Amino acid sequence: PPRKVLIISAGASHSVALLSGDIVCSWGRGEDGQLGHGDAEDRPSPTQLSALDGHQIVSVTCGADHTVAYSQSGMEVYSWGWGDFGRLGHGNSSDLFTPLPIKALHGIRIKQIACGDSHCLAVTMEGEVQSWGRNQNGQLGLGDTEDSLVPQKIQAFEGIRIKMVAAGAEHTAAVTEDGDLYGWGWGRYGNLGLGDRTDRLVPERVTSTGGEKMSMVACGWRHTISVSYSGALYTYGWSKYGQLGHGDLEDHLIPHKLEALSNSFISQISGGWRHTMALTSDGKLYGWGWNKFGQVGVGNNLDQCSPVQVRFPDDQKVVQVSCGWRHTLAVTERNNVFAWGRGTNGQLGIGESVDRNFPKIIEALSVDG
Template sequence: MASSFSSSVIAWGSGEDGQLGIGNNEEREWVCVVQAIESQNVRSVVAGSRNSLAICDDGKLFTWGWNQRGTLGHPPETKTENIPSQVKALANVKIVQAAIGGWHCLAVDDEGRAYAWGGNEYGQCGEEPERKDDTGRPLRRDIVIPQRCAPKLVVRQVAAGGTHSVVLTREGYVWTWGQPWPPGDIKQISVPVRVQGLENVRLIAVGAFHNLALQEDGTLWAWGNNEYGQLGTGDTQPRSQPIPVQGLSGLTLVDIAAGGWHSTALTDDGEVYGWGRGEHGRLGFGDNDKSSKMVPQRVQLLAGEDIVQVSCGGTHSVALTRDGRMYSFGRGDHGRLGYGRKVTTGQPMEVPINLPAPKSVSGSGAEGHWISKLVACGGRHTLALVEWKADESKP
């Protein structure tokens, strides 16, 4: 018989905007449980620059954190909300994936319909009826209640940057709107435009102002801001059109991630490659090398760990191993590395998941431990999905 397992959402790091969801605005240097959503079956979590969201198996969406711009999907009653609440406007659809940008959010349901809400001053929430101010300029108001965006597209994945939005359609094309970087001379920024030269795309990842797209054939493309080499093109020139990322030939890539100004790619044999901004050690190349990298380099300090996911935050990163351990590295203030020391380091260190056993097993004498299934790094905080794994009983 399948063992019943218990899962939890955990959080650590800065709590000043309520983004930890623990009922206060304190920071945490160790992991803690987000109690308010313990009764929900959460399937994924997303950490933004100052807020957080969780998607449940039944398609419910919960948000918490900073809400000055309607980023939580309902009108702001207070600037910050430190307890998760359900996004009522999306209660009748089944949300399967979501993203948080600078101060806007995107979500997609099981039928491929996309939704946007939050800050909209760059048109990042998408098409809208044309309103003009007294001087005849288009007026863009924040969207505090989620509404459909990109209505003509059937969407598979949404991704959000600082001031722009990117979606991957079911046919494998990439579309974008909002204020890209470099800004260029785009007039209609709130209308989705197809990114030329990309097809058969499997995955997209978006940083503050740069974009990555992984094709089915394993080629990785990048475009946008390149100030720190985060496009992996060997230089620091921004690109308005996709360009292949260098230094990855011969590797089979299975996942990609983009942080504020850095990027990572993961190979099928669990190896991590990092590039872009190296300050604070967020690339994981050790304490003697916190320089930026203009082409991907293998993260030797994670070699042999069999990494299955990497998440990149504003100034830190977390790598997840196949057996459910998490390694964090980068900037350490606010406790964002999760192991009780606010030291900034380029040395990946394990995040201990020291939580009591779930109530369903406590007292039964069953030994076990918590393992992580998914990690999400935000601006100054991290979320993870953990589940209880019973230790194999000795015969």
């Protein structure tokens, strides 16, 4: 059976993938250790992270300048990259250039991990949440403003099963299994969805949801995106670059339904530094927001304040998308992998390359060329 990409993830200037055979690979900026190869050099093409061979990794997730992965059979979570503020979770601030297990999470059944700039969170199979890293604006949800170098349980969610979490620069969001939406952390751009510009040190429930329950949530750097059980898309927070997608640059302090997509059912979402991607159930990918480096993928370098469909060869359907700070990655139905946007750190994975403003196939990871 031909080797394929199982999971992709984009960080600020790097890219990580999990391949069949439980193989982790990475490419892009390596200076802070985020690629995991033991050295500090950029890799312009996918490079196997051999130290994780045989660890049966089942998922990978990038933060801005660090990476996390976990194994079910090993009951282990691993982290590597820039170590400041405790974002790696090991009880110190050391950078790591090679993956190390987060001892505090050993033997815990992991459901999902989210990574922001300087903090991370893990959701357990029982719907509990642990968080770690920078906490200067309450983004850990622990009720104070002191950084945590190790994971701590978010006690505020006692009795509340969490389905998934999301993390931006310095804020955090979550949805419950029953459909409630929460926000906490740095809130100055309205990005918590609470109708104001004030931080929260513990999770606070978003009450203005258009009467709808939310099935998923994702964070860009200072904006937030959610999807309801009817497949409607909502955005809130920072609007400067059109990343909210409402056809203007208006601020939103509560979730605002994106009307242009109302006839579609959104199945996946991703928030970048200053851009946004949404995938429909029919496999159409839409992008919007900042496009200086071509990261929206629509064949130009003009910013886009309304969703525009990203096009692929033969109109192949998209199945996964992940936004970096200046680039975007996607996987299609044909098991092809594409990248676009900024390429100066090698993050596009296509060897030495100029920036790209529409999707470019990553030959190393694809069936086609």
